[PDB]
């Protein structure tokens, strides 16, 4: 929250609140967008994925996240363009912060500023992340690695604390490694989904089956 300094919340503590029929008075999240570059990009063309991870367990503010995304969206353009970056962020902010206001006071107090009826009102939407939990994620072509790591690097400045950058060993937004991705093409088990792969697999949820190979093929 831009009112407060975020020192106030960069440690993952207090069991986690949410939007609900119970917490109605929340503001709207800062980021309401997780769409950076060419979303209509096939899975069989952008074989690289890089990831950014919070080194530290902590909260991660919505505003901060938003700020980060335009280190990967100004920097989308100067390097490569829209035909390299596909980002789903990979964290949202469900968690909320309260504010027991005593700003009331700037000269005296009414005493309601005190800890009677202490409980704060919703003010500041925010994410919670462990050390592994991933926070940015660019699926891309493998002629763009140093020109996307520097986006991630830039973003890292705009997160509290320590942030590790990495490249995985997969085609990005897939379980399956680059080694096991070529299998799919080869063995006739690649099934496209405009973004994802379903990957054709024999199984039985029927009575006597043979369309389980002949369905998607």
């Amino acid at each position: 929250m831009g009112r407060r300094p975020a020192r106030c919340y960069r440690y993952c503590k207090n069991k986690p609140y949410i939007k609900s029929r119970y917490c109605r008075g929340v503001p709207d999240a800062k980021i309401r967008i997780f769409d950076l570059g060419r979303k209509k990009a096939s899975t069989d063309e952008f074989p690289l994925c890089v990831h950014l991870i919070s080194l530290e367990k902590e909260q991660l503010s919505s505003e901060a996240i938003e700020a980060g995304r335009i280190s990967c969206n100004k920097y989308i353009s100067k390097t490569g363009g829209k035909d390299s970056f596909h980002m789903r962020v990979r964290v949202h902010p469900w968690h909320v912060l309260r504010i027991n206001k005593m700003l009331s006071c700037a000269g005296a107090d009414r005493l309601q500023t005190g800890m009677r009826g202490a409980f704060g009102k919703p003010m500041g939407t925010v994410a919670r992340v462990n050390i592994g939990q991933i926070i940015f994620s660019i699926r891309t072509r493998d002629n763009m690695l140093a020109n996307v790591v520097e986006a991630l690097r830039r973003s890292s400045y705009k997160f509290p604390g320590r942030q590790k950058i990495v490249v995985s060993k997969k085609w990005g937004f897939t379980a399956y490694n680059r080694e096991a991705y070529q299998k799919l093409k080869a063995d006739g088990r690649l099934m496209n989904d405009g973004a994802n792969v379903k990957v054709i697999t024999n199984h039985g949820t029927l009575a006597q089956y043979a369309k389980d190979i002949a369905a998607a093929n």
């Binding site: 206001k101 700003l103 000269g107 005296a108 009414r110 005493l111 309601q112 009102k121």
Partner: protein, 250 residues
Amino acid sequence: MSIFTPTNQIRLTNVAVVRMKRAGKRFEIACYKNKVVGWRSGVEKDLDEVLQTHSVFVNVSKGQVAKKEDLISAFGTDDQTEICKQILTKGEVQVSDKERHTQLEQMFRDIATIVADKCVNPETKRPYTVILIERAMKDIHYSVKTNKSTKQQALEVIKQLKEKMKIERAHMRLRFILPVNEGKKLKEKLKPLIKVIESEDYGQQLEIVCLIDPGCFREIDELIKKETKGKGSLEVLNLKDVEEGDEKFE
């Protein structure tokens, strides 16, 4: 005793106090001085920004928090945020000095602007200038008032400017159609009293007249008519900026 072991003290606020008396009960709120104006100017900056506190007081100066019965009775509701909002919209608002000055400044401009709408016409391409009038106003000195409307103020002060001297404003043609019998009578009274032009008396084709006013003195020209004959067959009203056909007066 006081003198020995703390002689005690009093403490002053620096927060705006938006106040409204409903059902003979003062409700007040906690806001800041340079936000409470900005709210009303269409700068929706979250309600939680303008409110320093979300609660209602009988008196926010001392700090007497307001009561549920009092609230519901006076507002038709006990929910406080809504009430606060209402107060912000409706009630008197304390302001700083700078803020106050801004309003005054605005008013100053306004009273010049209103004078500029219709100005002295040798042809119809000369003055219509706000600045000169404003300057004149400044240099003559008169109390600019927030209780007083702008138009009224202008009316008041133009007279003063006249004997500076400086000629101001231009007249327009508020046109009428009188009856055959009463029209003549009207003409008999209205010719030497005020300026009347395009007069053409007839037996069959009625009588047309054009009473001279700037729009801001249309009560005086009509009153006499009302007294004598009542309203005309048609009563033409035109705008208070241009006379519909280009001004040539004063």
